């Protein structure tokens, strides 16, 4: 419950420093959190779709990598 | 010296250097870059020279011959 | 047998590049095209002896 | 011999600078991160 | 000169009539619909083929089409299409 | 008689089935795949045609102009999400204008 | 005398540190808790493998960093260093959303 | 006293006229000769019909109007109306090129 | 026909194109940028178009050839060659 | 195997078997699997050479996925070929905007 | 259980070009994903073009034009040349 806020603000500043930006506005953190929510919801939709299609109660690496490949991000390495 | 010329660069005067010019002449066996000290820069700019043609340069006389 | 190159048109500008006689940039303009040329200083002397100006073909 | 008349483009030509130029053909790339950051920050 | 070509003119026309027996059809729009149904069809078909290829199942059944539709079509149309197709399957099998 | 009539399906189940058989998809095809495919195409075509007819009738026309088709797919957010890269012939663009340029 | 760096100078060195590092910036427990919350409000009584979690966080940090240079380019186009809401909204709209 | 519309007044009406209309904005012959000459260098002796050209025309102007639209979005994000070079540069960069 | 054809697109054409795109003020440098990007798009499409045409043993490039050349790039043009 | 006498590393037999079972066409050519194996040799050699050069430039015998990601990145050919491809734990390029300094 | 990979193949390819450096396990997964990805991409493109000429047989020329079209000009021409040389030597 209310576990979405687990992504702390200094973490957001860290990924911002990954992108090479100096200053970050206040609304940016919660907007990024909303974008996170939408992105994970969209991914998990198709991930669990294949999961229940595969009559499995536990998710698998191949399931999510294939589901993401359907979208077109082409994750490489783990679960190749 | 003679051979196919592949690169010629010439720059205008700056406080750092009066004239900097680099040219690259490539032969069947060799391809290197010489440094142009003003006078040969003027000689090369006197007549239009395009890369990829065989030319001959006489160092003592300082004249340009296109083969 | 030989081939010759011919340039003609209306003059738009006379710009000398100036010890020595400098070259001149000419703005020859025809009805179907326009281009600029650099002229030998001997040609510059010759054309200036013609007493031409802007707008003279 | 020497060409008395040469085509010249005003914005392209400049007497200051004279430039002419001509298994897989690939240029050399430096993969050293230290060298790249040294070039970037200097 | 021409042997034969396949088009969805018939079924499209009866769809239009059973939903609106008053609106005419332009040929360019008709080609657009033909391309649209062709696109949807081959997308679903290739998705179902690879879908049989996930679990190494050599059989393609209505369940595979259903889950392919759920995965590619968004939730609303996914549930609508699967409900309609499932009901169609039940009554078609009941007809025997 | 055909299964489409007894199943009340307008689209041809046999044609879809034979397209699947020679469509190099799977060597084994169940009988549920063609009927499911015909049903889903019939639903999608019905919805698209209804929206296009609505777009045609709101423009004082009794025929579906391809521009009317373009608007019909464009107002619906869901149809926009379905086809975010397609180009519709003779469709033009939505009559969208920006509020900032308004004096 | 105290030795305090000018504002933003530490930003360059932390950028340098983070650019050479390929590690994830999200702790495992909050990420797992969020994914399990999505499962909980998604389908009851779901199980998660030890795998199928690395792909999640990996794709997320790739997407986030990508969107970050897009919004950085948008901000620098605006002739200002600080990012804002319109920058990220425009980047999202132009990327295909 | 001649009647002159102030600048920008007619722009809105051209936008209104063009947005409701879906006809090709490029003259046919210049486009077809452009296509012929660009296909020349790849391989000589080309052959084009009345069709196989309007498709290219339509794809082209659809792509161009989309590019102009998100260029307008970028220019609005720049707090100005007049488009400029960097607008189309970053629109192209952001859209996936 | 075979030389200096890139400038075939004219200033009023670009003005109409931008007006369709919604722009009301046009800069003085946009024209040849859009001309260059248009040329790039044309060569990118036409390369795959002629590849399809020659691999199919055809002397003419037809509407089907270009439409399914565009299909592989996600353009999936509708209408002609449906 | 025929690959050894043809100067092929990846086996033509396995590729032909995969094509037959890949649900592509009931008829598969004979020279097509050989051609495909040869082109796979080509790209594999290019990518391995680039990764090795990246590792050598970093003075590391080990080949970290950062080396491979750089091998993709500096050669624009591969970025055009792999635009949406993400390399696991490869980091990012050292890119800094000039105006930000 | 048994599972298939191109480990030894790219391994001795690397030893051929450079028998002095190694490749890691996650590098093995990266390379394996890369190879089967391009394999299936070329395969489906070839299937599409072969079936589109109303023909049900795929030959060397079909995959040849497939690799020619997917890859950029330099890779396309080099791959086509090396592949046709290999096939001509084979037959």
Numbering used by the authors:
A (entry chain D): 23 to 102
B (entry chain U): 136 to 202
C (entry chain V): 134 to 151, 161 to 199
D (entry chain S): 1 to 22, 43 to 62
E (entry chain G): 33 to 128
F (entry chain E): 16 to 118
G (entry chain A), H (entry chain B): 37 to 133
I (entry chain C): 21 to 102
Give excerpts from the publication.
Here we used single-molecule analysis to demonstrate two-step double exchange of the two H2A–H2B dimers in a canonical yeast nucleosome with Htz1–H2B dimers, and showed that double exchange can be processive without release of the nucleosome from the SWR1 complex. Cryo-electron microscopy analysis revealed different populations of complexes showing nucleosomes caught ‘flipping’ between different conformations without release, each placing a different dimer into position for exchange, with the Swc2 subunit having a key role in this process.
Two classes were of particular interest and resulted in structures at 3.8 Å and 4.7 Å, respectively. The DNA extending from the upper gyre is unwrapped from the nucleosome and binds to Arp6–Swc6 in the same manner as that described for the main structure.
